[PDB]
């Protein structure tokens, strides 16, 4: 019943992942892990659990990390 892998709300995957958009068709959204050390991020990667359309392919950085800017519109999950 709890359809997962494919996603619409973080809730159906949970703490450790977020409901990221697909790179193939915006139509599809899937579970993606919280951003780990060095992975790309977006400053608007809203907290978990988010029930809305995340819009981005990104997930918030893991608790012991923060989404810091590296270049124009390019942020990464660094240690903070």
UniProtKB/Swiss-Prot annotation:
Subcellular location: Secreted
One Gene Ontology term of the molecular function aspect: toxin activity
Principal location listed in the UniProt entry: secreted
Family matches, as Gene3D superfamilies: Lipase, subunit A (2.10.80.10)
The keyword Secreted appears for this protein: yes
GO cellular component: extracellular region
Chain segments annotated as coiled-coil in the UniProt record: none
Any matching Pfam family: Prokineticin
Tissue specificity note: Expressed by the venom gland.
Disulfide bond sites: 7-19, 13-31, 18-59, 41-67, 61-77
Keyword field: Disulfide bond, G-protein coupled receptor impairing toxin, Secreted, Toxin
GO biological process, one term: endothelial cell proliferation
Top-level lineage group: Eukaryota
InterPro entries reported for this sequence: Prokineticin (IPR009523), Prokineticin_domain (IPR023569)
Extra remark beyond the main annotation: Negative results: does not inhibit Kv1.1/KCNA1, Kv1.2/KCNA2, Kv1.3/KCNA3, Kv1.4/KCNA4, Kv1.5/KCNA5, Kv2.1/KCNB1, Kv3.4/KCNC4, Kv4.2/KCND2, K2P2.1/KCNK2, Kv11/KCNH, Kv7.1/KCNQ1, Kv7.2/KCNQ2, Kv7.3/KCNQ3, Kir1.1/KCNJ1, Kir2.1/KCNJ2, Kir2.2/KCNJ12, Kir3.1/KCNJ3-Kir3.2/KCNJ6 (GIRK1,2) and Kir3.1/KCNJ3-Kir3.4/KCNJ5 (GIRK1,4).
Role, per record: Potent agonist for both PKR1/PROKR1 and PKR2/PROKR2. Potently contracts gastrointestinal (GI) smooth muscle.
Family recorded in the similarity comment: Belongs to the AVIT (prokineticin) family.
Protein name: Toxin MIT1
Organism whose genome encodes this protein: Dendroaspis polylepis polylepis (Black mamba)
């Amino acid at each position: 019943a709890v359809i997962t892998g494919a996603c619409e709300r973080d809730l159906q995957c949970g703490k450790g992942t977020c409901c990221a958009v697909s790179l193939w068709i915006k139509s599809v959204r899937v579970c993606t892990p919280v951003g780990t050390s060095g992975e790309d991020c977006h400053p608007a990667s809203h907290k978990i659990p988010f029930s809305g359309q995340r819009m981005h392919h990104t997930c918030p950085c893991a608790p012991n990390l923060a989404c810091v800017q590296t270049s124009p519109k390019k942020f990464k999950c660094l240690s903070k």
